[PDB]
């Protein structure tokens, strides 16, 4: 007794309503956005890359890295559903399973441990936990992971900033602001290292 | 086979809704704004040019450099469609192609390779790659190219500032901030060389 067609449409329209929530919480969008935010503030440029471009890059990146799970949903939950092979209730479960598996690969056991105790449910295996518990654990792990990557990328720009300030202080020109002179070198290092292609490749490879 | 009048209208309104995205992700708007962002940052003025006029000049600059491609879209796609020479499906493809060609002229081979492997698809010719994968490669190349131009624009202003600081220190006045003295010199040398006209030539002509 699968859900009637009227209820099936009502469920799907509700999922489209929560589409921003699914992208910003259940996907890779948050980690990429935060790492780009740290990198932008690491250099002297405040909002030169602009917010729309940063989100635009992240949206394409989060679509590419989640193409495997997106295809797995299609090949196991959409095509059997359209071919009249699985109950609509079964198809919904078949779509949710790869999404849960992907979120578990990028989560930390400490995050699961605190939220499982917070929910107060007696579950032992770290695979049959509810989405209500998994999603906050996943987004917490993504924020912490983004900070680690953000600190990693920040260090070389801190090195340049300290060197420029030290060299200027060596000549006794303490009045000269190190930030104005430091910025072209920060652009210099990031461009001869091929930073933009490098960071997006690492962010793509990070989700594994 | 061809889309009905009702459906064609729906597609037209949809592209108008995404019009800001097409400007800042497919056209030359991103490179111009980033380069102009460096120019404002290089000089001692922080918000003095203000954000409004920079975007407005960038929009007019884009319409100038996109005029060949926009006219090519007009001739190849709009004119047969208005005269009812071709169907809506092929007219849309005839409009998409000039945009794809322009994005290929402003991208790099390495950037395309990274994203085509990232998408996990099969292709052998760059000319028939999907626009969904070309867009992230296009802007990534645009950001790297803009940083290169901005770095070159930042050097002469750094040159002026370092000279003024050295002169003041050499004269013995270790108490005066170089920024106040250097700012008129940076502005004077920006005007008597007609700096913006030179930047227009190296920015508008950089696409070709």
């Amino acid at each position: 007794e699968d859900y009637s067609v009227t209820l099936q449409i009502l469920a799907l329209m509700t999922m489209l309503g929560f589409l921003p929530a699914m992208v910003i919480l259940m996907t890779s969008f948050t980690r990429i956005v935060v790492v780009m935010s740290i990198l932008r503030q690491a250099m002297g440029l405040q909002q030169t890359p602009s917010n729309q471009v940063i989100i635009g890059i992240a949206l394409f990146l989060t679509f590419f890295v989640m193409s495997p799970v997106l295809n797995e949903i299609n090949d196991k939950a959409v095509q059997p559903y359209l071919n009249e092979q699985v109950t609509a209730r079964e198809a919904f479960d078949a779509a949710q399973a790869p999404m849960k598996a992907f979120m578990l690969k990028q989560t930390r056991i400490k995050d699961l441990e605190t939220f499982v105790t917070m929910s107060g449910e007696q579950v032992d295996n770290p695979e049959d936990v509810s989405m209500a518990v998994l999603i906050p654990a996943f987004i917490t792990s993504e924020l912490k992971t983004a900070f680690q990557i953000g600190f990693m990328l920040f260090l070389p720009f801190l090195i340049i900033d300290l060197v420029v300030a030290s060299v200027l202080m060596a000549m006794g020109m303490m009045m000269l602001s190190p930030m104005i002179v430091s910025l072209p070198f920060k652009l210099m290092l990031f461009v001869l290292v091929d930073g933009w292609n490098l960071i997006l490749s690492t962010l793509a490879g990070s989700f594994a | 086979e061809d889309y009905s009048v009702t459906l064609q209208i729906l597609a037209l309104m949809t592209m108008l809704g995404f019009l800001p995205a097409m400007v800042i992700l497919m056209t030359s708007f991103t490179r111009i704004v980033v380069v102009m962002s460096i120019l404002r940052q290089a000089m001692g003025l922080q918000q003095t040019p203000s954000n409004q006029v920079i975007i407005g000049i960038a929009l007019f600059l884009t319409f100038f450099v996109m005029s060949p491609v926009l006219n090519e879209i007009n001739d190849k796609a709009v004119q047969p469609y208005l005269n009812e020479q071709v169907t809506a499906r092929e007219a849309f493809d005839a409009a998409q192609a000039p945009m794809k060609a322009f994005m290929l002229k402003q991208t790099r081979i390495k950037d395309l390779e990274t994203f085509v492997t990232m998408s996990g698809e099969q292709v052998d010719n760059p000319e028939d790659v999907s626009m969904a994968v070309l867009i992230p490669a296009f802007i990534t190349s645009e950001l790297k190219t803009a940083f290169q131009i901005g770095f070159m624009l930042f050097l002469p202003f750094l040159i002026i500032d370092l000279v003024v600081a050295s002169v003041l220190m050499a004269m013995g006045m270790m108490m005066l901030s170089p920024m106040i003295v250097s700012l008129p010199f940076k502005l004077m040398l920006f005007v008597l060389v007609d700096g913006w006209n030179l930047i227009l030539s190296t920015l508008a002509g950089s696409f070709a």
Binding site: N71 | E1, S4, L7
Partner: peptide, 21 residues
Amino acid sequence: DFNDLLTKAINNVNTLQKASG
């Protein structure tokens, strides 16, 4: 695949409109 999902949906709507007209 998933990309063709949107294409199939639009074609069905176009076919339904074409038959209705």
